[PDB]
Ligand SMILES: O=c1ccn([C@@H]2O[C@H](COP(=O)(O)O)[C@@H](O)[C@H]2O)c(=O)[nH]1
């Protein structure tokens with residue numbers, strides 16, 4: 322699986338993923354499934370950000386903590402939006418809301434509930450994707466156009482197919498744990 326992650330994800334994503342894991346005392350070389358998951362989430366966030374018009378989104382995920390909060394605090398001060406308890410994935414300038422992205426190896430509804438439990442009374446929008454073309458979003462408001470969503474869903478399906486071709490899918494699919 323390590324060779325797979327290095328092969329299918331761009332180096333910027335891989336480096337960010339490795340850093341995140343190490344910050345948690347985890348070795349990307351050993352907890353490979355987790356390594357792949359972080360990379361996948363990151364790719365989706367970047368793809369999602371590229372989905373709208375130029376300037377539509379601000380990417381929060383993938384930034385170091387100080388920079389991430391700086392962006393979030395800056396957004397809150399200027400737009401008047403309430404400050405989230407934990408870092409969100411992106412900010413939508415058009416809808417003026419923060420977005421939390423989830424990619425799940427399980428089922429979208431369960432993952433959405435789990436995300437919602439963390440967010441609570443939070444006003445953050447939630448968008449969940451699966452590797453099998455399913456998606457779930459807050460108030461069924463999908464934010465992006467179908468073509469954009471389709472590209473993400475296809476890429477995820479593709480990752481799944483590639484993993485399966487290497488016999489890595491079964492382990493990967495079973496490595497996601499509940500809240
Ligand atoms: O402390 C953390 C925070 C996030 N994640 C992982 O980072 C990715 C993105 O998290 P989120 O933006 O969906 O919370 C997911 O694979 C999630 O498990 C962790 O492993 N530990």
Ligand SMILES: [Mn+2]
Nearest residue numbers: 382408409410
């Ligand atoms: Mn995040």
Ligand SMILES: [Mn+2]
Nearest residue numbers: 410421422423
């Ligand atoms: Mn996320």
